[PDB]
Scaffold this motif. Sequence first.
Motif, PDB file in Angstrom:
ATOM      1  N   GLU A  87       0.826  -1.247   0.000  1.00 29.76           N
ATOM      2  CA  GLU A  87       0.000   0.000   0.000  1.00 29.76           C
ATOM      3  C   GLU A  87       0.861   1.300   0.000  1.00 29.76           C
ATOM      4  O   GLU A  87       0.388   2.365  -0.394  1.00 29.76           O
ATOM      5  N   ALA A 116       4.991   1.527  -4.774  1.00 30.89           N
ATOM      6  CA  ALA A 116       3.595   1.075  -4.854  1.00 30.89           C
ATOM      7  C   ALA A 116       3.083   1.067  -6.302  1.00 30.89           C
ATOM      8  O   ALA A 116       3.580   1.811  -7.148  1.00 30.89           O
TER       9      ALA A 116
ATOM     10  N   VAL B  51      -2.942  10.441   2.076  1.00 30.36           N
ATOM     11  CA  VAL B  51      -2.933  10.990   0.728  1.00 30.36           C
ATOM     12  C   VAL B  51      -2.256   9.967  -0.176  1.00 30.36           C
ATOM     13  O   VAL B  51      -1.076   9.633   0.022  1.00 30.36           O
ATOM     14  N   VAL B  53      -0.669   8.861  -3.614  1.00 24.17           N
ATOM     15  CA  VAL B  53      -0.078   9.304  -4.855  1.00 24.17           C
ATOM     16  C   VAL B  53       0.616   8.136  -5.503  1.00 24.17           C
ATOM     17  O   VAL B  53       0.901   7.124  -4.836  1.00 24.17           O
ATOM     18  N   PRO B  54       0.896   8.250  -6.807  1.00 28.56           N
ATOM     19  CA  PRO B  54       1.564   7.147  -7.472  1.00 28.56           C
ATOM     20  C   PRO B  54       2.956   6.860  -6.918  1.00 28.56           C
ATOM     21  O   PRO B  54       3.686   7.777  -6.520  1.00 28.56           O
ATOM     22  N   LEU B  55       3.294   5.588  -6.897  1.00 23.14           N
ATOM     23  CA  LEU B  55       4.616   5.112  -6.539  1.00 23.14           C
ATOM     24  C   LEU B  55       4.915   5.169  -5.044  1.00 23.14           C
ATOM     25  O   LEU B  55       5.400   4.193  -4.477  1.00 23.14           O
ATOM     26  N   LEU B  56       4.636   6.293  -4.394  1.00 20.41           N
ATOM     27  CA  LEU B  56       4.769   6.352  -2.928  1.00 20.41           C
ATOM     28  C   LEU B  56       3.611   5.636  -2.249  1.00 20.41           C
ATOM     29  O   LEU B  56       3.762   5.118  -1.151  1.00 20.41           O
ATOM     30  N   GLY B  57       2.453   5.624  -2.904  1.00 22.48           N
ATOM     31  CA  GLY B  57       1.266   4.990  -2.363  1.00 22.48           C
ATOM     32  C   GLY B  57       0.642   5.864  -1.295  1.00 22.48           C
ATOM     33  O   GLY B  57       0.595   7.087  -1.428  1.00 22.48           O
ATOM     34  N   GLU B  58       0.205   5.245  -0.211  1.00 19.23           N
ATOM     35  CA  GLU B  58      -0.436   5.974   0.873  1.00 19.23           C
ATOM     36  C   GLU B  58       0.590   6.728   1.698  1.00 19.23           C
ATOM     37  O   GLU B  58       1.457   6.118   2.334  1.00 19.23           O
TER      38      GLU B  58
END
Lengths: 150, 151
Positions: A87, A116, B51, B53-58
């Motif tokens: 996640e 992610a 929040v 966002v792509p790649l970082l995720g949550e």
Amino acid sequence: GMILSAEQSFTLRHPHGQAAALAFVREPAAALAGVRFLRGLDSDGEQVWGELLVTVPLLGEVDLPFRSEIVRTPQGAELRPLTLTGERAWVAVSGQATAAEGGEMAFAFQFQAHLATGAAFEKMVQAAAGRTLERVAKALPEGLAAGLPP
Amino acid sequence: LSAEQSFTLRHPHGQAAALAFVREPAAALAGVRFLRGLDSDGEQVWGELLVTVPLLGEVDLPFRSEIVRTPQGAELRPLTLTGERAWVAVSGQATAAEGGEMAFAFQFQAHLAEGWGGAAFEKMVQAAAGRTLERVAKALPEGLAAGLPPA
Ligand SMILES: [Ca+2]
Ligand SMILES: [Ca+2]
Ligand SMILES: [Ca+2]
């Protein structure tokens, strides 16, 4: 693959000998703690964990966690990364260390960022992540050396 | 980078109970969603919004607010957090009236910390943070209602 991974290998002599060298490499939470770019290092003797900070615009400092199994080997220890949930971004920290007679220690570390799951946004995140992995990697020798007696 | 929500709800057990409910965050916020890691020591309440966002995720943005007891209910007044990482200011006011009629108002503000790379990043972060604020704000009436017991 060099953007989202980092590798570092080096040697250090333990001035107190093999027994001291073996003990040193077998307690990773303490040894890794000397690396300033690793934060929140902790261990329960079976596993070690912490976090790396990735700095990006607007969000600022974003922590990516890592957790690795501590494996005692005949010649020292290894860190084997545990797979974390997807996640949020995280890091796989792998390592191998050996202590020879006389106390010379050999280290190898590998870092892999697991992100992610547009192109401009992804490049920025990947660049920030890569810079963080390399900063930690390049700082490993100094950090471990700081944990040795003079 | 702001979101607001206001609404009314009746407490089935009347005024005294409604006052007690709004004054104890563990009661009022028991069923509230999208506030992860919610906790309190009776003096302050804290937690985080996510929040994505792509790649970082949550990405978690913390908040911490002071609980202020008032004659008709209670408020949350936000504390300033550091600029090292994005954070959220959560404010709220609640009143309980005759018959257990409750009024709520909540306000949220996200506090954020060149080139193509930088323009793409800003666009995506502002939009994502805006969605986060609205999701939590829009679900509040449902969440507060979920904390109420039957008559
Ligand atoms: Ca690299
Ligand atoms: Ca290298
Ligand atoms: Ca975090």
